[PDB]
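Lecture 7 notes: from sequence to structure.
We start with the chain below.
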Amino acid sequence: SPLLKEQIETIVTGKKATVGVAVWGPDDLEPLLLNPFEKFPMQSVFKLHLAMLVLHQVDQGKLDLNQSVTVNRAAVLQNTWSPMMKDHQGDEFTVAVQQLLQYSVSHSDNVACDLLFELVGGPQALHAYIQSLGVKEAAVVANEAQMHADDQVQYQNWTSMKAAAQVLQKFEQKKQLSETSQALLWKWMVETTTGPQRLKGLLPAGTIVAHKTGTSGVRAGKTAATNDAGVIMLPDGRPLLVAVFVKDSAESERTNEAIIAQVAQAAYQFELKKLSA
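Predicted structure tokens for the same chain:
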């Protein structure tokens, strides 16, 4: 709608970054997209995608939620924080597949993440699963260790704003997972504590927001990726899919996360005055 599109460009004009935006209202037939012709590094956003595959392999009996996974502290990556590698002690411990799922979705855990990649058959297995949802504009080629070894592979774990809209589309509607896998994914993706001043930064207190953040490192004053994608519950319990991906930014963290919040707040508000038209 060409009334909402205006306030977005006042939020993004003059801002030293490439900002891709996706909004899909509850009565819109298509998402409104800004810069849909660029490839946006995902960072930990695709941990949402992986959770869909891993739980879809759970739905089809390929895996089991509390199937245990063995964990050697030596053989895992360690640069990132990993709330897992803080909770457990000793040189070796076992963690169920369910537990690696919640760690990887809410706490954006990169070790729990890669084990989920071993269990499912590696990066291209996710890639194929993304073709499987109907999403053509996305590529997933590498895992968190390969991301930590080379900081430009992140650009190859990319997605478009139309693609962000399709994954969020298939997660909102509960048509791709069992009622229990869906209810669990939402749960891990609503009770997250990550990125409170992104999509939630300017929304009323207590708004349920199911979302997954993604953030990159800062090199020479540029941040490759500062992303938050999720689903926002309107006052009437209807869905609003908002994703904001700020690419290659010469701005601050406040500026980067504020753009996300302002975009979400404009979309949140607009939907609130859209039962008029």
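Points to note: The longest helix spans residues 253-272. Residues 170 and 238 are 15 Å apart (CA to CA).
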